[PDB]
Scaffold this active site. Structure first.
Site, PDB file in Angstrom:
ATOM      1  N   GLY A 118       0.823  -1.190   0.000  1.00  0.00           N
ATOM      2  CA  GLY A 118       0.000   0.000   0.000  1.00  0.00           C
ATOM      3  C   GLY A 118       0.862   1.246   0.000  1.00  0.00           C
ATOM      4  O   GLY A 118       2.006   1.226  -0.442  1.00  0.00           O
TER       5      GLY A 118
ATOM      6  N   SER B 280       5.613  -5.820   0.105  1.00  0.00           N
ATOM      7  CA  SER B 280       5.873  -4.388  -0.061  1.00  0.00           C
ATOM      8  C   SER B 280       5.895  -3.741   1.318  1.00  0.00           C
ATOM      9  O   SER B 280       6.688  -4.179   2.169  1.00  0.00           O
ATOM     10  CB  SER B 280       4.847  -3.818  -1.043  1.00  0.00           C
ATOM     11  OG  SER B 280       5.165  -2.480  -1.383  1.00  0.00           O
ATOM     12  N   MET B 281       5.073  -2.724   1.589  1.00  0.00           N
ATOM     13  CA  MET B 281       5.039  -2.128   2.918  1.00  0.00           C
ATOM     14  C   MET B 281       4.577  -3.117   3.977  1.00  0.00           C
ATOM     15  O   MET B 281       4.896  -2.938   5.157  1.00  0.00           O
ATOM     16  CB  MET B 281       4.136  -0.892   2.923  1.00  0.00           C
ATOM     17  CG  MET B 281       4.695   0.286   2.140  1.00  0.00           C
ATOM     18  SD  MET B 281       6.321   0.809   2.727  1.00  0.00           S
ATOM     19  CE  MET B 281       5.939   1.351   4.390  1.00  0.00           C
TER      20      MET B 281
ATOM     21  N   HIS C  26      10.457  -5.376  -2.270  1.00  0.00           N
ATOM     22  CA  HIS C  26      10.766  -4.768  -3.557  1.00  0.00           C
ATOM     23  C   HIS C  26      10.876  -3.262  -3.381  1.00  0.00           C
ATOM     24  O   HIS C  26      10.353  -2.690  -2.420  1.00  0.00           O
ATOM     25  CB  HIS C  26       9.706  -5.104  -4.610  1.00  0.00           C
ATOM     26  CG  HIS C  26       8.400  -4.404  -4.397  1.00  0.00           C
ATOM     27  ND1 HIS C  26       8.005  -3.321  -5.151  1.00  0.00           N
ATOM     28  CD2 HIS C  26       7.403  -4.631  -3.511  1.00  0.00           C
ATOM     29  CE1 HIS C  26       6.818  -2.912  -4.742  1.00  0.00           C
ATOM     30  NE2 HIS C  26       6.430  -3.691  -3.749  1.00  0.00           N
TER      31      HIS C  26
ATOM     32  N   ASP D 116      10.726  -7.810  -7.719  1.00  0.00           N
ATOM     33  CA  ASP D 116       9.936  -8.505  -6.708  1.00  0.00           C
ATOM     34  C   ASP D 116      10.656  -9.749  -6.210  1.00  0.00           C
ATOM     35  O   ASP D 116      10.890 -10.693  -6.970  1.00  0.00           O
ATOM     36  CB  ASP D 116       8.565  -8.874  -7.277  1.00  0.00           C
ATOM     37  CG  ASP D 116       7.720  -7.659  -7.592  1.00  0.00           C
ATOM     38  OD1 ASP D 116       8.227  -6.526  -7.446  1.00  0.00           O
ATOM     39  OD2 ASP D 116       6.548  -7.835  -7.982  1.00  0.00           O
TER      40      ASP D 116
END
Ligand SMILES: Nc1ncnc2c1ncn2[C@@H]1O[C@H](COP(=O)(O)OP(=O)(O)OP(=O)(O)O)[C@@H](O)[C@H]1O
Ligand SMILES: Nc1ncnc2c1ncn2[C@@H]1O[C@H](COP(=O)(O)OP(=O)(O)O)[C@@H](O)[C@H]1O
Ligand SMILES: [Mg+2]
Lengths: 101, 191, 321, 190, 340
Positions: D65, D94-95, D119, D170
């Site tokens: 996000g 991610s986050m 990533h 990724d």
């Protein structure tokens, strides 16, 4: 209310001698409340609403009969046991209070 | 989103978690500044002043910006009410969010260590259609707002108006340390 | 004889400082009460009823001291009761007339003195209903029976004067809800004078049963003691703390003295605790414990000077020999 | 969705998420937005006040996000006195992986079949307007990229150069690979 | 003459370790009371109230020791009462007049000395007021004792049996009352008065620190505990006892005449085995006892459970001469070093 039913009408109460509570390990005196007059009183606040609900039922609908719609004094002057039962008094107590002033 | 319910010990009272934080004078400005989100902040600021006009109000800001007039309703309410409004930057305070962050009581403007603070001149406060006479009017009003924002920002930051005019020309992103050096915030919280 | 309402305030100013409105209100009500008790209570005369007083004021304002001073003046017995010492459940009756046992014990159980006495009820606001109903049934004329002093004794409380009091904290906002324009508005009244205009609807909204308000017709207000009155309290009264400790040092050969800044600072410290003159004793004893322990050891001492630094800082009182 | 109601014996009726918050369990489910991140912050602040000493359990099932939204959670986790234990359910990408690695060292967990992906950030916002505006947003994205890699390297006890290689594209990891990498400390089984 | 506060506390240190503020408070109050009686020039308007003492503190903090040491030093009619034995006058037990009777017996029934003595009352927190009763005929052991005790603490005259088998009138205006007890609900009462806390970043957030809580007691807190307000108003001096720290517990462990260390060394002196403790052992024993929250009483439990596996064997082990208790024996499940 239930505890007052037998006391208001004729019964032989067992009272403490002005000294303590109503315990099993207690000395007692027998008092007959048959001829003792009881005068109950109270400010039945929500009684006017009950009397108005009973006397001005009416109804809703195109085919229903809508009844006309007298303050605390006027409504109290026509109080009936049905209103006192709807208010919260048990009929066994109202029957022991025949006079309503 | 489902807002959790928490129990306050006093008897017990059940709050949603935001009403529970409002009970301790924490007001959140999250997301874009709109008429509705700004008026909730104003309603909370007014309410908290009545509860206690002396205790600080904590204004937590995580906002990318929004309407200038909406942000000005918050801004004037912050300055009007008696209690100090401390401001804290969570995540980001951009555009009017950075303005309201700098608008906190001097000495009580905070930011978290990895927050992002961005200041810039306003964009469209409204469309510029119609005739050239209408466009001239809206352009003049936007320039007045631009000068008013830079002037109030310069006052908040103890900087010259000429400095804010340079630095708000294009999107000026700042770390918490750069915003502290600039004059937007006073302290950076760690623990 | 009987003290006039002016002489009552005259003698009561020596023990209490400030609250002149409540002082004259108590003086008038008490004088009228003990003049009614001198009426020809028989025949075709008018049966006279008493007028009780409701003392509204902050903590430490002197409500209990006012009542006790009135009692000492009029030779009547006095006992303080606490509405917080009366529980909702249980025999609220059995413990509401235990106050009568306390009042009787204060006057050798002679009903002739107790029936014309004074009773102060603390924390009248902290019961905002069974306790209220019992206090009402007792404030009104009733014959209560208590154990003997060693057969039971009877006490009719119709002639007993009742002075209820308490710190109605949230009463001022109940008043402002009807006296001001608004509370939360931008320009709308953001925050004892309003206590002075208190009306029965405010006390009822506060949670006092209307029948209790009906038997408390006199409403007197006490103002919060400021930093100035708390200094007089330390020096002026008959039982001033400075006077007590000066006597303690005076039975020995050491003269105790205070600096005016010391009195002002210690009065400000007491005011910062939201307790009024009640906290003055603790801070004075804390300040003078520096010497009350050393004075036994010190020899050749003549006087001690208590400066503001002793009250504010960890300073020792100056010992000059 | 209909959130079930449960009864706590003490009776008090809770929705099942408020009941778990009573046990100091905070959920981050789905994308990290301003609103979902502020709920996490509100819960973290509330739990510190209830008990500043007891651990807070932060359950993460998130594909990622907003970076600023995730940073509001991140700074709240580090600020508040109680340790924030993190647990990966399903995925932390991610986050979500950043906040997973952001848990208290020694208390970062993952379930055995969870998937953890790290990533470099994508667009933190569009890059339109003039070349001067695009240069500014490109510079800000590079600063965020370096800040994320630097904080990730600190969490994982690795060199910044390692995170710069591994977050280039990724990087999907099993729970075991994330434990070896330094994103989590333990893998729960029973 | 009259022992001064410095002398009073200098001899209280011989029996009570720690609790310096309370020793100062008791000494000053007692000296002021006796001097006030010797110089009744305070008959002037100044109403120096009888400075009674309320001695609050945790269990094992030394309340009952301060009372006994103050007693045996002051050389004054002193009685130690227990509110657990007190009852209402019209029921079985000891009415409050038995305390005056004991005070007379302590002075050969010379009422002139009894009327100027001291009355210590332990466990006064046990007669607090409570709601109407389960166990309901009358709350005899509770508020009734408080009122009968208040009638003595304030100036009154008591009637008590004669010196032999004619009652004696005893005026208690000049009798000093020192009441004490471990108010177990007082820390919760105070923690409700305060401990507001807060939420947010800029707010301070936070086992009960009953030391500083007891140090900030207010009369209303004791009223909430169940004490009648008129009794607290007659107890203006409030002496608070801190929880014994590691150093005070160590001194209690070693220094007193009847210390635990000496008690067990003599317990092993019934045999021919020497008992020796290491400094770290005493430190760890004091720490573990402080963690039990029972005061100096939790010290005996530690020393007893650490020596249990040794006292069980001493009569069987022959040739043993010395046993050394180290820090490992206390902190770990180890056996003391046996020296044969
Ligand atoms: N301050 C102290 N100095 C020396 N010894 C102490 C101290 N406090 C407690 N003790 C030890 O504890 C034992 C009993 O303590 P004491 O009876 O005085 O506690 P207490 O306050 O009466 O407890 P409780 O309130 O439970 O009755 C004594 O034998 C003594 O050796
Ligand atoms: N107006 C006053 N003048 C003199 N002393 C006061 C006054 N108000 C309070 N005090 C002191 O405070 C102490 C307790 O006050 P209290 O009677 O409890 O006040 P209240 O009844 O208003 O709470 C008393 O010892 C008294 O000497
Ligand atoms: Mg004891």
């Amino acid at each position: 209310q239930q505890a007052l039913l037998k006391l208001i009408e004729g019964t032989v109460a067992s009272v403490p001698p002005q000294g303590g509570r109503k315990h099993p390990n207690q000395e007692f005196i027998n008092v007959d409340t048959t001829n003792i007059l009881f005068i109950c009183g109270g400010a039945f606040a929500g009684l006017e609403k009950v009397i108005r609900q009973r006397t001005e039922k009416g109804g809703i609908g195109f085919g229903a009969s809508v009844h006309s719609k007298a303050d605390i004094t006027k409504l109290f002057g026509i109080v009936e046991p049905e209103d006192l039962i709807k208010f919260g008094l048990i009929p066994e107590l109202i029957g022991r209070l025949p006079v309503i002033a | 989103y489902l807002v959790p319910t928490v129990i306050e010990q006093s008897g017990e009272r059940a709050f949603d978690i935001y009403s529970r934080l409002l009970k301790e004078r924490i007001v959140f400005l999250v997301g874009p500044v709109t008429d509705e989100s700004a008026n909730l902040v104003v309603a909370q600021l007014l309410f908290l002043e009545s509860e206690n006009p002396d205790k600080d109000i904590f204004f937590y800001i995580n906002s990318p910006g929004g309407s200038v007039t909406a942000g000005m309703s918050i801004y004037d309410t912050m300055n009007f009410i008696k209690p100090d409004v401390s401001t804290l930057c969570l995540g980001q305070a951009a555009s009017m969010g950075a303005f309201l962050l700098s608008a906190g009581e001097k000495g009580k403007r905070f930011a978290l260590p990895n927050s992002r603070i961005m200041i810039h001149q306003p964009l469209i406060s409204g469309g510029l259609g119609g005739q050239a006479s209408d466009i001239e009017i809206h352009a003049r009003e936007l320039l007045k707002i631009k000068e008013k924002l830079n002037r109030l920002m310069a006052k908040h930051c103890d900087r010259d108006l000429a400095d804010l005019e340079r630095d708000t020309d294009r999107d000026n992103f700042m770390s918490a340390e750069e915003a502290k050096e600039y004059g937007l915030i006073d302290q950076i919280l760690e623990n | 004889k009987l003290p006039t309402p002016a002489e009552i305030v005259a003698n009561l100013n020596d023990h209490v400082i400030g609250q002149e409105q409540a002082k004259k209100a108590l003086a008038v009500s008490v004088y009228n009460h003990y003049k009614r008790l001198r009426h020809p209570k028989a025949g075709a005369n008018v049966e006279l009823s008493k007028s009780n007083i409701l003392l509204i004021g902050p903590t430490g304002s002197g409500k209990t001291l006012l009542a006790q001073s009135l009692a000492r003046k009029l030779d009547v017995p006095f006992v303080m009761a606490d509405a917080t010492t009366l529980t909702e459940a249980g025999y609220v009756g059995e413990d509401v007339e235990q106050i009568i046992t306390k009042l009787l014990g204060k006057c050798d159980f002679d009903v002739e003195k107790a029936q014309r006495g004074i009773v102060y009820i603390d924390q009248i606001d902290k019961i905002s209903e069974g306790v209220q109903q019992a206090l009402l049934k007792l404030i009104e004329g009733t014959v209560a029976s208590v154990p003997p002093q060693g057969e039971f004794i009877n006490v009719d409380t119709t002639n007993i004067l009742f002075i209820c009091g308490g710190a109605f904290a949230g009463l001022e906002k109940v008043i402002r809800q009807r006296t001001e324009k608004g509370g939360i508005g931008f320009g709308a009244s953001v925050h004892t004078k309003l206590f002075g205009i208190v009306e029965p609807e405010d006390l009822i909204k506060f949670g006092l049963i209307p029948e209790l308000i009906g038997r408390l017709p006199v409403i007197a207000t006490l103002e919060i003691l400021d930093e100035d009155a708390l200094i007089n309290i330390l020096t002026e009264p008959k039982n001033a703390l400075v006077k007590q400790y000066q006597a303690l040092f005076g039975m020995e050969n050491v003269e105790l003295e205070f600096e005016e800044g010391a009195l002002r600072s210690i009065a400000r410290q007491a005011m910062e605790r939201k307790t009024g003159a009640r906290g003055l004793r603790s801070i004075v004893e804390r300040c003078l414990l520096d010497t009350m322990y050393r004075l036994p050891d010190l020899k050749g001492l003549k006087k001690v000077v208590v400066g503001k630094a002793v009250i504010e800082e960890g300073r020792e009182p100056e010992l000059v020999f």
